[PDB]
Design a binder for this molecule. Structure first.
Ligand SMILES: CCCOc1ccc([C@H]2CNC(=O)N2c2ccc3nc[nH]c3c2)cc1
Ligand SMILES: [Zn+2]
Length: 323
């Protein structure tokens, strides 16, 4: 008779009021993040290397520094890769982890393995230090409000290893992080003791971010069972714009677009979604014109965009959590 799983089909947004946003637009400050959240991620960081680890620590410190009561839990494993077994580790960052329901956020901190062509390295700027670093200034910004969390539903933050693939994408050499977890998180009952429900059973919603940081992104509305949460993201945008809180932004050149399209882009939402969770996959289509090049660097980013895309995702969740 598990009622409380049923609670994400229908759950509505706590829509904020005119000058509620007008703070959130000033609670969030991009540069800090860009100096402090971001640039310590812009190093090679494929798995088994030191740039992993280093990426792993800098993420956690910036989830420990916070007043909110995060519990950071690690998921280390070994998993045959085309270079033989190796050691992976998802980050997790749940508020209130016996809370039955979690809005989830997500994004692979690893980064593809690219030969130092022309002596140059691949750091993953759009792909995806921006999502991770987007997923820190949330926390920080919403520190002040998340502290009130100490409708059984909070937040949680994940960070994936080996989304990418060492050599050639495939179902045995891609999304190593997700695949392993989404496994587990279907086997780890939840809350602790629940005899017919698994943590997934509480995963309200998998907002995935990925390939973020370049101008003029284009986010399709991939799914029918998460439109109403896609739409939510357009709306917020619509008016934020018409109030004056965005930066180099035009109605025509909006980000989300309620134009469903061709088809699927498989990413780390998948193993969960191939198990029956709502995703809110936030992946532009077209990708950036740099996607997997030694030009995915920091320059080829756009401040004004992520700043704008920063504001939207913090608002969305607030409304969501009802805070
Ligand atoms: C303009 C760039 C378009 O190129 C594409 C790149 C990736 C994909 C998707 C679609 N199916 C996949 O498996 N893709 C893929 C490949 C590698 C990735 N690394 C991170 N995300 C990836 C997605 C499609 C077009
Ligand atoms: Zn990639």
């Amino acid at each position: 008779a598990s009622a409380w799983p049923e609670e994400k089909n229908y759950h509505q947004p706590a829509i904020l009021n005119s000058s509620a946003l007008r703070q959130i637009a000033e609670g969030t400050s991009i540069s800090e993040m860009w100096q402090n959240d971001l640039q310590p991620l812009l190093i090679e960081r494929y798995p088994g290397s030191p740039g992993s680890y280093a990426a792993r620590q800098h993420i956690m410190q910036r989830i420990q520094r916070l007043q909110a009561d995060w519990v950071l839990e690690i998921d280390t494993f070994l998993s045959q890769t085309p270079y033989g077994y190796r050691s992976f580790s998802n980050i997790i960052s749940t508020l209130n982890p016996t809370a039955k329901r979690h809005l989830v956020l997500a994004c692979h901190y690893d980064s593809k393995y690219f030969s130092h062509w022309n002596n140059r390295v691949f750091v993953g700027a759009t792909d995806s230090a921006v999502p991770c670093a987007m997923m820190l200034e949330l926390a920080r910004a919403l520190d002040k409000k998340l502290l009130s969390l100490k409708p059984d539903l909070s937040l949680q933050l994940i960070f994936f290893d080996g989304e990418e693939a060492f050599l050639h994408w495939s179902p045995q050499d891609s999304l190593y992080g997700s695949r392993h977890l989404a496994a587990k998180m279907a086997s780890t009952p939840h809350p602790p003791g629940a005899r017919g429900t698994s943590q997934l059973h509480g995963m309200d919603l998998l907002v995935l971010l990925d390939l973020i940081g370049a101008p003029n992104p284009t986010f399709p509305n991939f799914f029918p069972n998460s439109a109403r949460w896609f739409e939510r993201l357009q709306a917020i945008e619509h008016e934020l714009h018409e109030l004056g809180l965005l930066k180099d932004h035009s109605l025509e050149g909006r980000y989300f677009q309620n134009y469903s399209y061709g088809g699927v882009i498989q990413d780390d939402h998948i193993p969960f979604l191939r198990r029956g969770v709502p995703v809110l996959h936030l992946i532009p289509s077209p990708f950036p014109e740099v996607w997997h090049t030694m030009d995915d660097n920091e320059e080829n980013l756009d401040e004004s965009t992520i700043d704008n895309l920063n504001k939207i995702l913090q608002v969305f969740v607030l409304e969501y959590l009802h805070l």
